[PDB]
Each structure stands twice: as structure tokens, then as C-alpha cells.
Design a protein around this nucleic acid. Structure first.
Lengths: 159, 99, 56, 104, 50, 99
RNA sequence: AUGCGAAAGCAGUUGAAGACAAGUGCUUGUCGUUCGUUAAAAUGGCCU
């Protein structure tokens, strides 16, 4: 409704609805809340992130939380999170943005050195390698975008 | 040090320090944080007496100051806000936005 | 250094004050990082000129 | 249009004559797709630039400059994105290397 | 060297010696670009292995 | 005004109004009327400054003799010119790179 | 170069009149002129 929408519009929004509104919000109001909300609990935030709803919730919530919080806190939260969902989400990622690649950095931090799957990891290798290659290609394309002796002349004129 | 690299840029910041040398008040845009000098982290409320480490305000903060161990003075381009520190409640509000 | 930090990662992630303890490596590599972008700039202009004269 | 060298030669012929419109089409296509796996069209653009800069700069002032700036912004995001990204590549590299140490 | 190239393209076309000079330059700059790249990879491990 | 204060040397645009020649130079005594001269800057200037920018033909500084015989002027390119009034003939002095 | 913005960028901007000079009444220029808008040259370098 109009009242709750303009409450979302106005910055300050005190405590309890910020605590648990996401469960209630899980359409148009959901978009408005994610694009503007002063306080967002990382639990529900990463749960919605890892939901495969993917109406560009990925990019939206990623840029949101990256503007909102700290990489260390994120890493702790998604250590507390499970890893199966991590695998599925990164599978979607490698199948097919600086926000999401920063999330890739973060999730590698969270996972550390233990849980990795060989073939999946090699698929990641190829994907990331080709995407690198194209990226530096884009770099030189940018930078390029940013970029006497008449010893004897056998000539003539039209008099 | 305490080095976060947020993917956003705010040209407006402020910060203040308690006389004790232990309580540090960093007002980054729209939010103040209290940090311990010894840990450079949010002052966790083990008692949880509504002394939340962050204050999210009406507007982006341009000025912070402290007069004593008691009173914090924060200017947002809309308002001036005087907040008590022993009791975490805003004492005074002053309309500045038209000016 | 690659093999070193490869093999002995666990103990150092156990030891807390990694920044100060690893200080010089940090600063060296950050210096080289700081080099990167202008280096790319020089590379691309050099390719431009090289193609310019090699085409003929 | 497939080989880079025949691209160069037909590009020289285009300079003999079309050049502006192919420039604009390449620009718009790439500014829609900053992540085309194909490199042929990037080779087209790189060659035309590294051959024929000043005249392309001089030909027009609004309709080329504007979309040039827009694709410039998109690629700008790309060059911002690169560094930590190839860092990510390195991370995965040395994760595989640790896995090798685990296997043996 | 950027400004040098900007001024002296045509004399570069002319002179043969200068061309091989730039060739050597290009070799070295590719080399150091590479070295910087793997430098950034290992700073990547620093960030991980914190 | 002369360093004595006894003389005034100024320029006027009335010859610009009545002529292609622009600037009229007039020097006058103050406490008496013993001296009063006037002449066009066009006559003053060189025969080459007619094919260059307004920079050269721009007067930028004025100064006077104590005995009404020498006058100094300076232009935008830094070329001082000194005029002796009797024959009304000049000398060029050139050190300042700017006006 | 304006506004906005982060050290990125995003939008916006380049109007007339008057005057005078040169050129053949007409072409170009110029302005120690106006209002209107968010608007490269005079061989000539640093004291004891």
C-alpha cells in the first residue's frame, strides 16, 4: 500500500520490521524494499541472494550488500551458511558484474582451502581464464580509444 | 588501521574522539559508528541496553563533535541533532534545512 | 615464495598478526600492483606505434 | 571478413571509400555486448583505430562522440573490474596447486 | 616514451635503428607486464591466506 | 601621472571614432599650460604589428618623464617602447616575456 | 570551461545585435561594445 511504500521511501525505519520484514516481502514492494532499506540482516540477505529466483536479484542484492557491509562480516556469515547452495550458485555463475566477481572473491575467502570439487574447479579455471583474456582485450581496446625529398620528379601540369 | 573498501564513495565524512582515548565516533555518510580504540570494532553491547554501536540518521552526516562525556552534536544538512550518550536518545532537534 | 605459502598456509593462518609479520612482502607486491595500470597504458601505445610502422 | 589480414586489406579499401557507418555499427554492437566471446569484431575495431584515427576523430562531432563516450563508460567498468578478477584467477590456480599437493 | 612516440612516429618510420629499439622496448614491456600479473596473483594469495 | 605629479599622460578613443587610427595620446601640464601634445598611437607603432594579433597592439602600461621629454609605454607581449617627444621617435626595449 | 558527482563520471552548453578592418554595394575578420543564457608569435628568461 501507499503508506508502507512511502515508509520504505523515507530513510529511517526503526527496528522490528527491519528485523523481520523480508519473510513477509518474499513483488513490487519486494523490489522497493531491496532497492531502499536502511537495515538489512545478513542472514536473510544472503538467503535471498542465494535463492535462484534470479530476477536480477543477484546484481541488485549484491550491489546493495556491497554498499552496505564489510567483506569480513560477509565472509563470516557465509561461512555460517552451508556449501551446497554455494556450489549451485557458483554453477549458475560459471554457466552465465564487478559486484558478482567481488562476491566470487568473497566466497573463495569463506571456503578457504578445504571443500572444492575437481571437475567443477577446472570448469571454473577455463571460464575464468577465457573471461580474463577477453577482459584484458577490452583493456587495450580502451587504451587505443584513448589514443621532403624531390630528387627527381616526373610530373606534369594542366596549363 | 581499519581498512574497509566499500564500492561506494562519499565525499562527506567526520569523526570525533572521547577525551578518555577509548571511544571513537566515526560518522560516515548517513551512519555514525562507535569503535573501541583497542579493537577498532563496534562497541558490542553485552548488556544490550539499547546502546547500539551504529546510529543511522535522517541524513548524511557532515559534522560530528562532542562537548563532554555526555553530549554529541551532529549536523546533517537538514538538521542539527544533540544526542545524549549515557541514555541513547536524541535530546534536541533543530531545523536547519531551509538555511 | 609461491611454494612456501602454498605448503605452510595453515600455521600462518593460525598465527594472528599476519600483516606486520609478512610486512615487506605486502609492500613489495602492492608496489608492483600500483605499477600495473600505467604499464598497461605504455604497452597499448607501444602496440599502436608498432603496428603503425610494421604495416608498411 | 574472417581473417584478420583480409580484414586489414578490405579495411584499406573501405578507407579508400561506408567507413563511418561501419564504425558506428561496430561501436553500437560492442557497446551492447562488452562480453562477446568472438574477437573478430574486436579485431575489426582495433585495426581500424590503429590505422585511421585522426580522420575518424574529425569526421563527426555529436553522433560518433556520444556513443563513443557510452561504450567508453562500459569498457571503463571493464577495466575497473579486471585487476582483482585476475587475482581471482590466481586464487583458483593455487587452490588447484594445493589440491595437487593433497593428491600426491 | 609515450610523448616521444607521440612526436616521432614518422621519423620512426624512416629510421631503421629506432624501429629495432622499439622492438626491444616492446619485448621488455611485455615481460614486465607479465611479471606484474603474477605479482598480483601472489598478492591474491596474501589476501586469501590472511 | 608624472612622478612629479606635474604632468598627465592619457589616451582617448575619439580618433578611433573619427579615424581608422584608434588611440590618441595626449600629455599635458597641470599647474600650468606650458606643455600639451597629442598624437596617434597608430603613428607611434611599428609597420609590422599590423599583421599580428591584438596582443601586440594592446597598450598595457604608461609612465612619464619628469621633464616632459621621455615617455614609457608597455604592451601585452612585454615589449617596452620609449618615446622621445621632440622628434616623436622611439626605441624598443625587450625583456619581459609576458605583458 | 556548466551543473551534479568520488579522485570516476552523468547531463548541459558554442546566442544574437552593434561596431570597425580587410577584400569585390557584397566576402572574411576583428571588438578597451552590448544584451541573452547553467557557459601560439612582436629574438624577446631570473642579481651580487
Amino acid at each position: 500500500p501507499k503508506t508502507l511504500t512511502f515508509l520504505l521511501t523515507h530513510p529511517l525505519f526503526p527496528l522490528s520490521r527491519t528485523r523481520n520484514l523480508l519473510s513477509l516481502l518474499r513483488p513490487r514492494l519486494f523490489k522497493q524494499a531491496i532497492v531502499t532499506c536502511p537495515n538489512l540482516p545478513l542472514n536473510e540477505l544472503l538467503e535471498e541472494l542465494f535463492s535462484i529466483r534470479n530476477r536480477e536479484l543477484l546484481l541488485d542484492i549484491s550491489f546493495r550488500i556491497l554498499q552496505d557491509f564489510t567483506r569480513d562480516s560477509i565472509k563470516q556469515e557465509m561461512k555460517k551458511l552451508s556449501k551446497l547452495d554455494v556450489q549451485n550458485f557458483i554453477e549458475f555463475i560459471t554457466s552465465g558484474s564487478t559486484q558478482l566477481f567481488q562476491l566470487l572473491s568473497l566466497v573463495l575467502d569463506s571456503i578457504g582451502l578445504f571443500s572444492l570439487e575437481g571437475a567443477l574447479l577446472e570448469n571454473l579455471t577455463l571460464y575464468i581464464d577465457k573471461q580474463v583474456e577477453i577482459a584484458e582485450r577490452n583493456t587495450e581496446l580502451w587504451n587505443l580509444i584513448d589514443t621532403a625529398l624531390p630528387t627527381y620528379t616526373m610530373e606534369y601540369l594542366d596549363i | 588501521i581499519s581498512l574497509p573498501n566499500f564500492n561506494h564513495f562519499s565525499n562527506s565524512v567526520s569523526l570525533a574522539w572521547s577525551q578518555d582515548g577509548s571511544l571513537i565516533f566515526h560518522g560516515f555518510d548517513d551512519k555514525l559508528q562507535i569503535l573501541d580504540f583497542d579493537t577498532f570494532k563496534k562497541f558490542e553491547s553485552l548488556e544490550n541496553t539499547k546502546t547500539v554501536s551504529e546510529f543511522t540518521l535522517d541524513s548524511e552526516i557532515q559534522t560530528v563533535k562532542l562537548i563532554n562525556d555526555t553530549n554529541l552534536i551532529v549536523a546533517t544538512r537538514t538538521t542539527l541533532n544533540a544526542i545524549n550518550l549515557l541514555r541513547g536518545q536524541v535530546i534536541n532537534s533543530f531545523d536547519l534545512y531551509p538555511f | 615464495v609461491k611454494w612456501c605459502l602454498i605448503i605452510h598456509g595453515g600455521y600462518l593462518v593460525s598465527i594472528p598478526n599476519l600483516m606486520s609479520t609478512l610486512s615487506s612482502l605486502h609492500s613489495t607486491l602492492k608496489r608492483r600492483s600500483d605499477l600495473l595500470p600505467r604499464l598497461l597504458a605504455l604497452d597499448a601505445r607501444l602496440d599502436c606505434t608498432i603496428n603503425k610502422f610494421k604495416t608498411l | 571478413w574472417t581473417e584478420p589480414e583480409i580484414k586489414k586489406f578490405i579495411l584499406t579499401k573501405i578507407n579508400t571509400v561506408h567507413l563511418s557507418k561501419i564504425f558506428l555499427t561496430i561501436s553500437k554492437s560492442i557497446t551492447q555486448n562488452p562480453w562477446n566471446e568472438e574477437n573478430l569484431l574486436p579485431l575489426w575495431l582495433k585495426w581500424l583505430l590503429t590505422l585511421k584515427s585522426g580522420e575518424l576523430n574529425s569526421i563527426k562531432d555529436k553522433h560518433t562522440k556520444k556513443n563513443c563516450k557510452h561504450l567508453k563508460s562500459a569498457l571503463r567498468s571493464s577495466e575497473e573490474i579486471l585487476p582483482v578478477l585476475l587475482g581471482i584467477q590466481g586464487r583458483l590456480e593455487m587452490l588447484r596447486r594445493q589440491a595437487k599437493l593433497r593428491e600426491d | 616514451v609515450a610523448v616521444v612516440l607521440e612526436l616521432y612516429g614518422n621519423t620512426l618510420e624512416s629510421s631503421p635503428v629506432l624501429q629495432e629499439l622499439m622492438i626491444d622496448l616492446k619485448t621488455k614491456v611485455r615481460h614486465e607486464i607479465h611479471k606484474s600479473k603474477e605479482a598480483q596473483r601472489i598478492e591474491g594469495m596474501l589476501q586469501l591466506l590472511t | 601621472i608624472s612622478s612629479n605629479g606635474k604632468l598627465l599622460a592619457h589616451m582617448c578613443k575619439d580618433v578611433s571614432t573619427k579615424d581608422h587610427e584608434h588611440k590618441s595620446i595626449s600629455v599635458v601640464s597641470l599647474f600650468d599650460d606650458s606643455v600639451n601634445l597629442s598624437f596617434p598611437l597608430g603613428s607611434i607603432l611599428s609597420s609590422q604589428t599590423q599583421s599580428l594579433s591584438y596582443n601586440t597592439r594592446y597598450v598595457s602600461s604608461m609612465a612619464i618623464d619628469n621633464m616632459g621629454q621621455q615617455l614609457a609605454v608597455g604592451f601585452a607581449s612585454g615589449v617596452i617602447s620609449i618615446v622621445s617627444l621632440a622628434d616623436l621617435q622611439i626605441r624598443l626595449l625587450k625583456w619581459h616575456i609576458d605583458s
